[PDB]
Amino acid sequence: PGPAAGSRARVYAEVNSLRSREYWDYEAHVPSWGNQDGYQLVRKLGRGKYSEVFEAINITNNERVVVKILKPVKKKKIKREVKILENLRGGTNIIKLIDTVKDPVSKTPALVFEYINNTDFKQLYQILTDFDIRFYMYELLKALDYCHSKGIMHRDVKPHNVMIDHQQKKLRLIDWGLAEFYHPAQEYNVRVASRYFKGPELLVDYQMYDYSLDMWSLGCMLASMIFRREPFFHGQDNYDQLVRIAKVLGTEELYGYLKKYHIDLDPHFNDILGQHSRKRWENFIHSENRHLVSPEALDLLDKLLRYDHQQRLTAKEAMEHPYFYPVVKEQ
Ligand SMILES: O=C(O)c1ccc(-c2oc3c(Cl)cc(Cl)cc3c(=O)c2O)cc1
Ligand SMILES: [Cl-]
């Protein structure tokens, strides 16, 4: 049984307390809403229920940008995303927020981002080499270590939210609409991230999580790339999602996790979790993915995909792993 006061982040815990209230009090942020008519929408790029994203042209200087039209959400959530993007501007592999505009007629707010010649991850993951996976995971870890060091949890890390220009070897972490400031001992909403990338803490309703949530999501991405099984944990709902995790990580460490953090498990799980062994990571190797798997890759994966969020590697610890030695050597 751990501290009755709850979990605390192992790194970057005091970041926001060392900065002024204006840094993290996003409700007090006052954005400068410009005129969206300065941008000509060209073509829809995708996305879903929170926004619609368009390729666009800055009419004044003809520069190619991306416009994200914010579907009706609470103004508070809009201030949070804008403030976080402003705090993170210039960050390593963070998407650059260019402008904050509103449609002159509808007054619907929109965010303007830099354009990156992205390759769909469904297509990119089929052609990634062993070195490519290490390179892009390393660049993604730079983005996560940066935002974590700025006191921010992304909380929606997934392949859809990682833009990659495979020709120029450029990576940008996008979609900061679910990001939040980390404050020690704060309890957070667990309805974040995509189902396939939700950490165990979200699935068992443990609200006192921290940056390590993003590290679970990253481990899910690493597993899907080196094993060519995307997504790796392919649950049908939130209950089945934890079952599919428990069938790989085993149930003993799951119940040990619940006991350590005094988590009251939803009684529905007791009829579906069962008892499962902790599987060996080598069991997912086959002839089609063997060239992407190495002992260093399995060791890193094993140290990211842990129930205990406190035992997961931090972003900086993961960056120092021998799995990235070829990337570090290439400067
Ligand atoms: O919600 C967000 O924060 C957010 C931010 C950026 C983008 C974004 O998407 C792109 C897509 Cl989907 C395709 C292509 Cl070819 C290029 C881009 C791009 O350059 C770009 O910036 C999408 C969403
Ligand atoms: Cl076991």
Author numbering: 2 to 332
Sentences copied from the publication:
However, in addition the Cl8 atom forms a geometrically well-established halogen bond with a peptide oxygen of the ATP-binding loop, namely the peptide group connecting Gly47 and Arg48. A similar halogen bond, namely between an inhibitor and the backbone of the ATP-binding loop, was not observed in any CK2α/CK2α′ structure before. Here, it occurs—well documented by electron density —in protomer B of the CK2α′Asp39Gly/Cys336Ser/FLC21 complex structure, i.e., for the first time with CK2α′ and remarkably enough in correlation with a novel halogen bond and with the strongest ATP-binding loop deviation in any CK2α/CK2α′ structure obtained so far under low-salt crystallization conditions.
In this regard protein kinase CK2—a cell-stabilizing EPK accumulating in cancer cells that apparently exploit CK2 activity to escape apoptosis and to assist DNA repair —seemed to be an exception. Thus, the classical conformational switches of EPKs are not used by CK2α which is consistent to its constitutively active nature. Previous analyses have shown that CK2α—in spite of a conspicuous overall rigidity in comparison to other EPKs—has structurally rather variable regions.
